[PDB]
Design a protein around this ligand. Structure first.
Ligand SMILES: CCCCCCCCCCCCCCCCCC(=O)OC[C@H](CO[C@@H]1O[C@H](CO[C@H]2O[C@H](CO)[C@H](O)[C@H](O)[C@H]2O)[C@H](O)[C@H](O)[C@H]1O)OC(=O)CCCCCCCCCCCCCCCCC
Ligand SMILES: CCCCCCCCCCCCCCCCCC(=O)OC[C@H](CO[C@@H]1O[C@H](CO[C@H]2O[C@H](CO)[C@H](O)[C@H](O)[C@H]2O)[C@H](O)[C@H](O)[C@H]1O)OC(=O)CCCCCCCCCCCCCCCCC
Ligand code: CLA
Ligand code: CLA
Ligand code: CLA
Ligand code: CLA
Ligand code: CLA
Ligand SMILES: CCCCCCCCCCCCCCCC(=O)O[C@H](COC(=O)CCCCCCCCCCCC)CO[C@@H]1O[C@@H](CO)[C@H](O)[C@H](O)[C@@H]1O
Ligand SMILES: CC1=C(/C=C/C(C)=C\C=C/C(C)=C/C=C/C=C(C)/C=C/C=C(C)/C=C/C2=C(C)CCCC2(C)C)C(C)(C)CCC1
Ligand SMILES: CC1=C(\C=C/C(C)=C\C=C/C(C)=C/C=C/C=C(C)/C=C/C=C(C)/C=C/C2=C(C)CCCC2(C)C)C(C)(C)CCC1
Ligand SMILES: CC1=C(\C=C/C(C)=C\C=C/C(C)=C/C=C/C=C(C)/C=C/C=C(C)/C=C/C2=C(C)CCCC2(C)C)C(C)(C)CCC1
Lengths: 82, 36, 35, 98, 447, 28, 137, 34, 488
């Protein structure tokens, strides 16, 4: 079939591709990295960090009990929880 | 742990085995430069 | 029942022998243009 | 005319509360200061005892061993030897591992 | 040979099947990676080898072989000379350069056609004799060391023999085997459980003893083909084409690799376990041994102990040989190793022996083998399918036996695709089916 | 420790032959 | 933070004294425990003889007490049944018997104290998962 | 302009280096068992 | 050579013969109604609306005759358990003797629209051929629908003209068919609120009438009639199969989860009613009131009502069944004859214990008696050699309050155990199994089946939808791809 949208080999092999990108690609690679390093990713998605999955003493699991006052639960767990 | 006097090279001794593979790899690099 | 033991062999041998003697007579022939 | 499980029933005697010299698996012997290892091989070996004390009068028991048994006597009990519990030399290896 | 007038890129090496190979050098080229690989891994192996840690406990596939030959071991499977191992890899490795240094050449700067430079034996496949004579060389070639080994076995140091009197220990094969009934007899031996035609081999006397017989037998072939031309039922039978030659030849590996995979999993003789892990069956027999002891030692009669099923825990009965360990373990009553043979009897396992002549050096070797068993995950967490991460160990036998099968399998796939395409030249329909002259569009319709 | 840097060079040893070959000529 | 100082502190002598500990020693404990061989002994059970476990209580009831960071040391040096009646040295890894179990040679009082502390410590965190097997897994 | 193969191999090694990192990362990585 | 699936296509045009078709699948269904209707009627037992209400007996079709209002049979009995009052002709028998005559005539109107297949009405004037106007035809039928939907909405259910509809509430249940008043307030949407139904029909009726007129008058944009290829009947089929299947999934929902369109007693109690101990908690309240109200724990439970304990029996929880477990809940646990009594298990120490129930997912299950606080004080060992909590070694025991067992207690380790394992099922009961010869395994309630019915059915229909919709629109390419090629 007749195809005509801006070619690929062109730019993957392009001089400009590598010059705009070289600098920006790792900008994302780095950006992601920082997202992890700051440790914000954790707070970003509640995702606990090894240091804080279980409180110190307790052995039970901080399980969400009631679907409607769930927000509380999480807290009261994340609460007593270190 | 190689003889004491070789202490310096545990680093290479470490890699030497990867090479074999490396060849099937290169075989491609060339085939690519030579447009198949 | 040692009988069976042999009754089979022959039946097995026969065939194995018919197998080989069939491929033995070379099959480079028995295809398109007997080449 | 009401047949019934034997182990289940004997679990209802004092067998379930303490250690049965004549039946109980040799494994329940570790649960006390220095009994398992040897004393048990003799406790378990050595005929079945009609009295909980006849343990103390076991051929060759040591002046110390003798003591121990005395000391631990508290936890030992007895009930008819249980064919189903002793057959198969199960008493040595009941099939129960961690 | 460029593209057109050749195959595609993935079938690259096919354009080397055209004219006279520009390079033997390819084959030599890698005939190096193969020898260099020993040079790296061997170095790498020792590079990680500790003398105390059981050789099989430290992912040693390569190193255990040197040991099995009598090098750097001696009393028990203990390693005294960290040197010998190092030696062999160092050599090979370096040795590889020359192998590669040349193959690398023969492929780019030498005769792009040795068909012409021919002279020296030379090149062309259909040439029925250049091929009979060539393999002929490589036949004297192999048998060559068949003796090389016999020497190491009889004149340079000996081998490791687990059976060997005292206990595992570097020993010299004094009296190899004469009698052809024995050395040959194995081939005629059962293939199934109880007697594997190749695998079943108690001692070295029959190994090195047999190798001898193979060196000469094999040399007598190179000497043979080198001098003559194959008969007419031969020509009549087998297609001759460079490819077709690979085709056969390749399916000798397939088979052979299985013969390895099936061998490295089963023998304690040529694979001592002091260097490899305890053989699969050995394991579930070792367990037996350990517990037969645990209770007997705990005061149980053992021999007369009625087991859960109706058989008996510690001791059971097999149909032909009367007495063996019982569990599910039975499957392996054919297992034989020095750690369990003393406690053997006329009728089988002896109650009198097992009861009082069962020594300590066994309870501890028996327990090592109970633990260290050929069971692990790719993850490399040695143990039952469902074990916690902690003790990890994968038997050399696992990797060895496993790999070779997948490869040897794959090769069988090869023996096919190279026979499938080669039996095709034989008539010329290999390129395809001719649109105007196909046998079928002109044949009596089946009905 | 160092192991990594020294592996690096050998790994880029091969594509470098391709490069040194691109510039000069031959092969084809 | 979770592997705290006192939770890493355990009994030394049958007399009460506590040796507390470090993240360093603990580690060697792990490295050791496994190298000293978990092959029968993996997790917290005992494959050669499942009847005996390494749980804190079990070591206490042993003879002599074997819950002491001390105890286990004697053992590893010289082993004894749960009787404390006959030395089990020939069938169990022990410095008394190195020539049998090689791994036991490179072992030192430093290396021991560690593998020891590892045993008395692991339960404190893993709970029952220490003694039991399969079941708790 | 820039030769095509040269972008492939350097692009590739990255996948082979990054992926390689990931395997190491499973040994000391949080997800290890230590 | 015309293949079979293509054979029913015959008509497509020629609406004449088609009318006689629908005129049949219609006289064939109607029949089936009166049919099994008679059948179920040939087997329903009224003897006890207490432990043998329809739903256990494997009743599927008779459950509806109640929704609408037919409570009784010409034989002096009802489903509520009435006396002396016998319905008019329109009683179960009627409903059946009814559809029986219906289909029976439609079969005739049927074999009519065939011979008499070519009529003026089916012939379009201006066009020399047989054509059927749909863009309007449709709106017409619509007008009747709503006209009826409302005609029903306000004229039936409201009790104004006819009987109400089956309703009750979570006690008893003391269900019955009474008149309903459409309550339009927001809670008319609480699916549960019955009123919320009469309000919808009276209300959607309006919306239908209007629409009909609208579609009987207004004409479809040439932009739609060109897209939805109206005119080609093939499209009305995908244009409907679509709704039909959705209509399904809704009946599949209302059925499974609760809803006033599918009661508690005319259909198996909801599987969720047992998920949350709905029945035991709404019970404890009453046995607690009665208790802290100066009554013997005995007078207490003997206070709780038969039917209600029963609901608290996992054996009615719709899930437990089996895809091939061939029949009515009765050849399962048997015929429920009566409630034995609540079984409270006492420790030897005197402590009260509870049988930790069996969650709907397990066919198998180990009984465990937990201390009132989740702790474990009793079980029935499997190893039994290392048992630490056996009934016998912990002297478990059982007393009984209410039922027929009442004020009795059982001590022997065997029976005490037994009673427990049967308690894991909820409220123990006494089932006559001999009569029907039950098997000892559970079966699923009507509610259960019905759901799985308008299940695989609706999940398939969307495939018809996708198939005809696709054969409606591409009736062009249908034949071949068009010998012409290369452009695109
Ligand atoms: C009798 C007629 C049978 C008709 C069957 C015809 C079917 C067609 C063949 C296709 C596959 C079936 C053939 C079976 C071959 C497999 C071998 C086998 O089953 O026999 C089992 C034996 C095992 O030997 C073992 O030998 C042991 C002896 O060792 C023991 O004792 C020794 C000393 O005696 C040592 O001490 C040692 O340490 C100790 O372990 C025991 O006796 C065991 O009981 C015994 O099992 O293997 C061996 O020796 C034989 C090794 C042969 C090489 C096979 C390679 C691997 C198989 C791949 C199959 C290819 C097919 C693939 C097709 C699909 C795509 C590829
Ligand atoms: C085959 C063709 C396929 C075409 C594919 C097309 C793809 C397009 C997808 C669009 C639609 C998908 C998304 C819909 C999400 C709806 C959310 C929902 O589920 O809504 C959630 C609720 C569920 O309520 C439930 O209620 C239960 C009990 O509550 C009720 O009962 C309790 C007592 O137990 C209490 O009394 C309580 O007060 C009372 O509310 C529990 O609480 C549950 O946790 C809770 O989920 O459903 C409701 O209200 C809503 C009413 C349900 C309508 C269901 C329509 C069809 C799907 C359902 C069929 C299921 C049965 C299938 C049977 C086999 C085959 C069909
Ligand atoms: C005869 C083939 C063979 C066999 C049986 C082994 C076996 C082993 N090697 Mg090994 N190795 C080989 C060839 C082989 N190797 C070659 C040619 C090299 C050079 C590159 C190496 C380099 C090497 C290193 C550096 C190490 C090992 C190690 C090991 C041991 C553990 C590895 C493992 O658990 O990961 C399992 C690995 C996989 C499951 C790879 C997945 C396979 C994928 C990629 C698909 C494969 C499909 C194909 C059919 C199989 C290819 C065959 C193989 C040659 C690649 C194990 C005994 C480790 C060890 O024991 O240290 C002492 C170790 O550190 N090897
Ligand atoms: C492995 C099997 C193998 C086989 C069958 C061959 C076969 C051949 N090689 Mg060869 N080669 C090999 C491996 C092999 N090579 C390896 C591993 C290398 C790495 C260097 C080489 C490097 C090499 C070179 C540079 C050349 C060949 C050449 C040849 C051809 C010349 C035959 C001849 O008369 O030599 C007979 C050789 C001997 C009988 C050995 C004599 C040993 C002593 C007495 C003198 C040899 C010189 C000295 C020892 C070191 C060699 C230096 C070197 C310049 C030769 C012949 C086809 C020649 C060629 O171009 O063929 C067309 C050629 O120029 N080869
Ligand atoms: C190393 C690789 C190799 C290759 C590719 C070949 C290839 C060949 N050799 Mg050969 N050979 C080799 C090594 C090799 N040889 C070695 C190392 C020796 C040492 C002697 C020989 C000795 C030798 C001799 C003496 C002869 C050959 C011959 C041949 C040619 C015919 C072989 C044939 O097709 O057998 C096909 C054979 C069969 C399919 C046998 C089927 C019949 C069965 C049933 C035997 C019956 C079994 C019997 C009962 C015993 C056990 C049976 C069973 C239970 C196990 C063929 C070109 C023949 C040739 O023409 O010139 C040499 C020939 O006469 N070779
Ligand atoms: C909803 C009502 C409905 C109506 C009136 C039609 C009408 C039609 N469909 Mg159809 N269809 C429907 C729903 C409907 N379909 C659904 C829900 C699906 C997907 C689940 C399909 C999938 C479908 C396909 C793939 C095709 C049709 C076709 C047709 C046309 C002729 C096919 C034919 O009659 O085969 C004759 C029928 C038989 C010979 C019966 C044998 C098939 C099974 C084994 C019978 C089982 C039913 C019976 C035993 C009891 C019925 C119980 C009931 C609850 C289902 C005809 C216009 C054909 C067509 O016109 O071409 C595009 C065609 O190819 N349909
Ligand atoms: C490239 C991947 C690869 C790697 C890393 C290995 C590695 C190994 N293979 Mg092996 N193998 C492979 C592919 C590979 N194989 C393939 C594709 C096949 C065909 C299915 C085989 C068939 C095979 C067999 C039959 C045996 C091995 C054995 C071995 C081990 C000893 C090497 C050796 O025998 O030295 C030099 C040769 C020997 C030490 C013994 C020679 C055996 C006699 C001479 C029969 C013929 C040898 C064999 C056919 C030649 C293959 C040698 C190998 C280097 C490719 C070693 C771990 C041996 C083993 O099990 O461990 C000791 C062994 O017996 N392999
Ligand atoms: C040969 C190729 C030919 C075709 C077949 C190839 C099959 C290859 C299979 C490999 C898949 C899994 C990779 C190993 C996992 C690993 O190990 O990497 C992990 C994440 O992986 C991953 O993130 C997997 C990445 C796959 C995501 C694909 C999403 C599809 C959208 C892509 C759009 C691109 C435009 C990172 O490590 C994990 O997380 C670490 C924490 O950082 C832990 O420490 C552990 O290491 C843990 O494993
Ligand atoms: C140091 C040393 C050495 C050297 C060597 C060598 C020679 C090596 C090598 C090497 C090599 C040479 C390696 C490799 C290779 C290759 C490569 C580096 C490649 C590549 C890459 C990549 C990444 C790719 C990719 C791709 C893609 C993308 C797809 C397909 C195609 C391709 C392949 C291109 C030795 C060892 C001898 C020893 C001595 C010293
Ligand atoms: C694949 C191929 C190729 C190539 C090549 C080949 C194939 C081969 C080979 C081969 C080779 C490539 C070889 C070789 C080599 C060499 C070596 C391998 C070396 C060496 C040495 C070493 C390694 C050493 C080191 C050391 C020493 C010296 C001693 C001490 C220790 C140390 C380590 C220091 C290509 C791609 C082109 C294509 C074609 C084919
Ligand atoms: C004398 C007369 C008559 C007669 C008759 C009738 C009425 C009837 C009938 C009948 C009927 C009304 C029938 C039928 C029905 C049924 C149906 C139509 C159906 C069936 C079934 C089916 C269709 C099926 C289904 C199924 C199966 C098959 C099995 C499985 C499941 C399913 C679902 C799949 C009448 C009365 C009309 C009246 C008029 C005259």
């Amino acid at each position: 079939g007749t195809t005509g949208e801006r070619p690929f080999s062109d730019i993957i092999t392009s001089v400009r591709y590598w010059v705009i990108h070289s600098i920006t690609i790792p900008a994302l690679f780095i950006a992601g990295w920082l997202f992890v390093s700051t440790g914000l990713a954790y707070d970003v998605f509640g995702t606990p960090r090894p240091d804080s999955y279980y409180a110190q003493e307790q052995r039970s699991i901080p399980l969400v009990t009631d679907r409607f006052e769930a927000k509380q639960q999480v807290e009261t767990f994340l609460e007593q929880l270190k | 742990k190689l003889p004491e006097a070789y202490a310096i090279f545990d680093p290479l001794v470490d890699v030497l085995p990867v090479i074999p593979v490396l060849f099937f790899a290169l075989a491609f690099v060339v085939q690519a430069a030579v447009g198949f | 029942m040692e009988t069976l033991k042999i009754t089979v062999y022959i039946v097995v041998t026969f065939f194995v022998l018919l197998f080989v003697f069939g491929f033995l007579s070379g099959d480079p022939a028995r295809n398109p243009k007997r080449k | 005319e009401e047949l019934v499980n034997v182990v289940d029933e004997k679990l209802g005697t004092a067998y379930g509360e303490k250690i049965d010299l004549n039946n109980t698996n040799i494994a329940a012997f570790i649960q006390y200061r220095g009994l398992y290892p040897t004393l048990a091989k003799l406790i378990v070996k050595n005929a079945p005892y009609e009295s909980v004390e006849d343990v103390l009068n076991i051929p060759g028991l040591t002046e110390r061993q003798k003591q121990i048994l005395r000391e631990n006597l508290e936890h030992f009990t007895v009930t008819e030897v249980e064919t189903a519990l002793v057959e198969g030399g199960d008493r040595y290896n009941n099939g129960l591992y961690k | 040979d460029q593209e057109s007038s050749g195959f595609a890129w993935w079938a690259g090496n096919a354009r080397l099947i055209n004219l006279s190979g520009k390079l033997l050098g390819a084959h030599v080229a890698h005939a190096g990676l193969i020898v260099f690989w020993a040079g790296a891994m061997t170095l790498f192996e020792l590079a990680h080898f500790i003398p105390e840690k059981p050789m099989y406990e430290q992912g040693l596939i390569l190193i255990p072989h040197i040991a099995t030959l009598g090098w750097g071991v001696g009393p028990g499977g203990e390693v005294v000379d960290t040197f010998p191992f190092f030696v062999v890899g160092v050599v090979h490795l370096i040795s590889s350069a020359v192998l590669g240094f040349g193959g690398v050449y023969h492929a780019i700067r030498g005769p792009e056609t040795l068909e012409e430079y021919s002279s020296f034996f030379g090149y062309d496949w259909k040439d029925k004799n250049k091929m009979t004579t060539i393999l002929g060389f490589h036949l004297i070639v192999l048998g060559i060391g068949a003796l090389l080994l016999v020497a190491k076995a009889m004149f340079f140091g000996g081998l490791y023999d687990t059976w060997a009197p005292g206990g595992g220990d570097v020993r010299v094969i004094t009296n190899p085997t004469l009698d052809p009934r024995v050395i040959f007899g194995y081939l005629l031996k059962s293939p199934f459980g109880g007697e594997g035609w190749i695998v079943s081999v108690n001692n070295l006397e029959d190994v090195v003893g047999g190798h001898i017989w193979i060196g000469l037998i094999c040399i007598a072939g190179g000497i043979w083909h080198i001098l003559t031309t194959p008969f007419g039922w031969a020509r009549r039978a087998f297609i001759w084409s460079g490819e077709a030659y690979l085709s056969y030849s390749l399916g000798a590996l397939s088979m052979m690799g299985f013969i390895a995979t099936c061998f490295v999993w089963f023998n304690n003789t040529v694979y001592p376990s002091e260097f490899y892990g305890p053989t699969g069956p050995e394991a579930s027999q070792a367990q037996a041994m350990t517990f037969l002891i645990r209770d007997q030692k705990l005061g149980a009669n053992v021999g007369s102990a009625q087991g859960p099923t109706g058989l008996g825990k510690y001791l059971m009965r097999s149909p032909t040989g009367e007495i063996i360990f019982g569990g599910e373990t039975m499957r392996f009553w054919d297992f034989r190793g020095p750690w369990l043979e003393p406690l053997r009897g006329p009728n089988g396992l002896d109650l009198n022996k097992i009861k009082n002549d069962i020594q300590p050096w066994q309870e501890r070797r028996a327990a090592e083998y109970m633990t260290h068993a050929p069971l692990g995950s790719l993850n490399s967490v040695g143990g039952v399918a469902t074990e916690i991460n902690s003790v990890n160990f994968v038997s050399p036998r696992s990797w060895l036996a496993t790999s070779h099968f997948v490869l040897a399998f794959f090769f069988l796939v090869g023996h096919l695709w190279h026979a499938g395409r080669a039996r095709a030249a034989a008539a010329g329909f290999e390129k395809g089916i001719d649109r105007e002259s196909e046998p079928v569009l002109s044949m009596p319709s089946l009905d | 420790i160092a192991q990594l840097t020294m592996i690096a060079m050998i790994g880029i040893a091969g594509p470098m032959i391709i490069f040194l070959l691109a510039v000069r000529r031959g092969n084809l | 933070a979770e592997l705290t100082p006192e939770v890493l502190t355990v009994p030394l002598n049958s007399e009460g004294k506590t040796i507390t500990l470090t993240e360093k020693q603990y580690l060697e404990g792990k490295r050791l425990f496994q190298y000293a061989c978990a092959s029968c002994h993996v997790g917290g059970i005992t494959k050669t003889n499942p009847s005996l476990d390494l749980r804190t209580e079990t070591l206490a009831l042993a003879t002599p007490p074997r819950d002491n960071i001390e105890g286990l040391v004697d053992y590893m040096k010289n082993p004894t049944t749960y009787d404390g009646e006959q030395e089990i040295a020939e069938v169990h890894p022990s410095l008394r018997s190195a020539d049998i179990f090689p791994k036991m040679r490179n072992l030192t009082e430093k290396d021991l104290v560690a593998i020891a502390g590892h045993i008395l410590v692991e339960p404190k965190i893993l709970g029952d998962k220490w003694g039991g097997g399969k079941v708790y897994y | 302009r820039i030769p095509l193969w040269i972008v492939a191999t350097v692009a590739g090694m990255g996948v082979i280096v990054i992926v390689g990192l990931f395997f190491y990362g499973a040994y000391a990585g949080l997800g290890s068992s230590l | 050579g015309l293949p079979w699936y293509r054979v029913h296509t015959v008509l497509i045009n020629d609406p004449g013969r088609l009318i006689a078709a629908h005129l049949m699948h219609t006289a064939l269904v109607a029949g089936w109604a009166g049919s099994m209707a008679l059948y179920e009627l040939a087997t329903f037992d009224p003897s006890d609306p207490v432990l043998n209400p329809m739903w256990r007996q494997g009743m599927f079709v008779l459950p509806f005759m109640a929704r609408l209002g037919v409570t009784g049979s010409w034989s002096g009995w009802s489903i509520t358990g009435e006396t002396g009052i016998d319905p008019g002709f329109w009683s179960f028998e009627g409903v059946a003797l009814a559809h029986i005559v219906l289909s029976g005539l439609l079969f005739l109107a049927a074999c009519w629209h065939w011979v008499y297949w070519d009529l003026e009405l089916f012939r379009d004037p201006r066009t020399g051929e047989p054509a059927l106007d749909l863009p309007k035809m449709f709106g017409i039928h619509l007008f009747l629908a709503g006209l009826l939907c409302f005609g029903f909405g306000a004229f039936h259910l409201t009790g104004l003209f006819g009987p109400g509809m089956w309703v009750s509430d979570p006690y008893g249940l003391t269900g019955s068919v009474q008149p309903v008043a459409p309550e339009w307030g927001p809670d008319g949407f609480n699916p549960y609120n019955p009123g919320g139904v009469v309000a919808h029909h009276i209300a959607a009726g309006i919306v239908g009438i209007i629409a009909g007129l609208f579609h009987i008058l207004v004409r479809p944009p040439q932009r739609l009639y060109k897209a939805l290829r109206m005119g080609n009947i093939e499209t009305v089929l995908s244009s409907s199969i679509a709704a039909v299947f959705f209509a399904a999934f809704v009946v599949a929902g209302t059925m499974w989860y609760g809803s006033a369109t599918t009661p508690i007693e005319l259909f198996g109690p909801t599987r969720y009613q047992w998920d949350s101990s709905y029945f035991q908690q709404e019970i404890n309240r009453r046995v607690q009131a009665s208790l802290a109200s100066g009554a013997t724990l005995e007078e207490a439970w003997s206070a709780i009502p038969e039917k209600l304990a029963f609901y608290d029996y996992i054996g009615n929880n719709p899930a437990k069944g089996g895809l091939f477990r061939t029949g009515p809940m009765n050849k399962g646990d048997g015929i429920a004859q009566a409630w034995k009594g609540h079984a409270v298990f006492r420790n030897k120490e005197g402590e009260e214990l509870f049988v930790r129930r069996m969650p709907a997912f397990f066919e198998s299950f180990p009984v465990i008696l937990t201390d009132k606080n989740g702790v474990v004080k009793a079980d029935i060992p499997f190893r039994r050699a290392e048992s630490k909590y056996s009934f016998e070694q912990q002297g478990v025991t059982v007393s009984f309050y209410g039922g027929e067992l009442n004020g009795q207690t059982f001590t022997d380790p065997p029976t005490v155990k037994s009673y427990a394992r049967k308690a894991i099922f909820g409220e123990i009961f006494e089932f006559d199994t001999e009569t029907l010869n039950s098997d000892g395994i559970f079966r699923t309630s009507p509610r259960g089946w019905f759901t799985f019915a308008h299940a695989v059915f609706a999940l398939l229909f969307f495939f018809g939808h996708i198939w005809h919709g696709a054969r409606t629109l591409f009736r062009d390419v249908f034949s071949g791809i068009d010998p012409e090629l290369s452009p695109e």
